[PDB]
């Protein structure tokens, strides 16, 4: 049982968006669908919910009128429409069902007059010197993109232990950058291949880049 | 509406301790209160619902209790996998309301020294006009660290940015990555690039350096 939500959106101030989440594991008509959001480094705000087999709807006073929740029972999906989007409304919007189901993956909405830009993925090559413990660091540098979510995984989710993806930083240009590193046995630098899987949905940028010790 | 007063907002405690987060309600909500756990950084996952009914898969060290207006989430035998922010949520009436949240940090007893790595800019990036070097500080426990850049013994200031992870869910440590961004012209004009890191666990500042054109 899982919910997939639409990609991270960039929209201009005062515009309107329609976020979606599809269900695979249960029926939409069989439970209530709820939307909650989370502003960057803030708590959880409950937006509203739509009753099973539509069905009435309930909302939170601060989203009353500026938010409408609907479902496409044929497609087994749910929608959230937001209008008059201000710079306060940039957050991660979760969609979930009443019951013991997991929450949606999350859709990051960014309200801004800036333009989308795709990232450039660079290798952080492990140095030829191999220090004690048998450890060596290698990583990927993701530079110059907007808006945020760039999701980084290693070996398509296989490599997890030792992985640190840092929070993004905001450059003077208005573009974000973040790094993702991983510690790895030095004896395997030439044998084991290390790939970083970079996704950036607003620009449709899907890149897997191998990091590899530079040959001298 | 019904407001949930969650307390404390932040809580730091040593490994193995017992933890109690409380959530007071402005009105009576019977037993229709739930708890959620949000590790950094993924989606919130349900821990406990109906005040005390555990959810299958949640460790037994989590327990909940309360009725009416008083509720408490108990975490016995505090493990590093419990680094997260916790929220209480009521469902007695609409609109449903969450608590302010509780940032839970591990108070690790021993100081951990950072492993320092430096990375030259990729030749792929040098075709674009900019050249950014990266200094890695991973797995250390006190958050306070200081990074300084020296390009040919010249103290670089204002042209670097830093970022720090949350507490590692395994050794309760942090990690830091500093990116020094230079133009391609400036990079090719100088040879020596160093990263001097001072820290409580080092006893003496360490410096990882490299010369451009080594390889």
């Amino acid at each position: 049982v899982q919910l997939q939500q639409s990609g991270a959106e960039l929209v201009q101030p005062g515009a309107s968006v329609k976020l979606s989440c599809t269900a695979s594991g249960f029926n939409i008509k069989d439970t209530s669908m709820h939307w909650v959001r989370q502003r960057p480094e803030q708590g959880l705000e409950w937006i509203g919910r739509i009753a099973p087999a539509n069905g009435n709807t309930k909302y939170d006073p601060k989203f009353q009128g500026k938010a409408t929740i609907t479902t496409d029972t044929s497609s087994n999906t749910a929608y959230l429409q937001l209008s008059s989007l201000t710079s306060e409304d940039t957050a991660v919007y979760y969609c979930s069902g009443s019951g013991n189901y997991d929450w949606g993956q999350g859709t990051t909405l960014t309200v801004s007059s800036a333009s989308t830009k795709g990232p450039s993925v660079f290798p952080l090559a492990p140095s030829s010197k191999s220090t004690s413990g048998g450890t060596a660091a290698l990583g990927c540098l993701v530079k110059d993109y907007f808006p945020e979510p760039v999701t980084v995984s290693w070996n398509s989710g296989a490599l997890t232990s030792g992985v640190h993806t840092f929070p993004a930083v905001l450059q003077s240009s208005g573009l974000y950058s973040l790094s993702s590193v991983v510690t790895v046995p030095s004896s395997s630098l030439g044998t084991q291949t290390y790939i970083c899987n970079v996704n950036h949905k607003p620009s449709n940028t899907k890149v897997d880049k191998r990091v590899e010790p530079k040959s001298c | 509406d019904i407001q949930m007063n969650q307390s404390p907002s932040s809580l730091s405690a040593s490994l193995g301790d017992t933890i109690t987060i409380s959530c007071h309600a402005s009105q009576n909500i019977n037993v229709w209160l739930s708890w959620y756990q949000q590790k950094p950084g993924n989606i919130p996952k349900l821990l406990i619902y109906e005040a005390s009914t555990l959810y299958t898969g949640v460790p037994s060290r989590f327990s909940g209790s309360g009725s009416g207006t008083g509720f408490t989430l108990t975490i016995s035998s505090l493990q590093p996998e419990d680094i997260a922010t916790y929220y209480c949520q009521q469902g007695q009436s609409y609109p449903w309301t969450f608590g302010g949240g509780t940032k839970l940090e591990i108070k690790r007893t021993t100081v951990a020294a950072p492993s320092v790595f430096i990375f030259p800019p990729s030749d792929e990036q040098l075709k674009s006009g900019t050249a950014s070097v990266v200094c890695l500080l991973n797995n250390f426990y006190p958050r306070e660290a200081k990074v300084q850049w020296k390009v040919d013994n010249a103290l670089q200031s204002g042209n670097s940015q830093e970022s720090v992870t949350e507490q590692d869910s395994k050794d309760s440590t942090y990690s830091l990555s500093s990116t020094l961004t230079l133009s391609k012209a400036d990079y090719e004009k100088h040879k020596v690039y160093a990263c001097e890191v001072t820290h409580q666990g080092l006893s003496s500042p360490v410096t990882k350096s490299f010369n451009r054109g080594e390889c």
């Binding site: 439970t31 209530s32 009443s98 | 739930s34 109906e50 949520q89 469902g91």
Partner: peptide, 6 residues
């Protein structure tokens, strides 16, 4: 009646 948690 409907569930009261997410």
């Amino acid at each position: 009646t409907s569930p009261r948690h997410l």
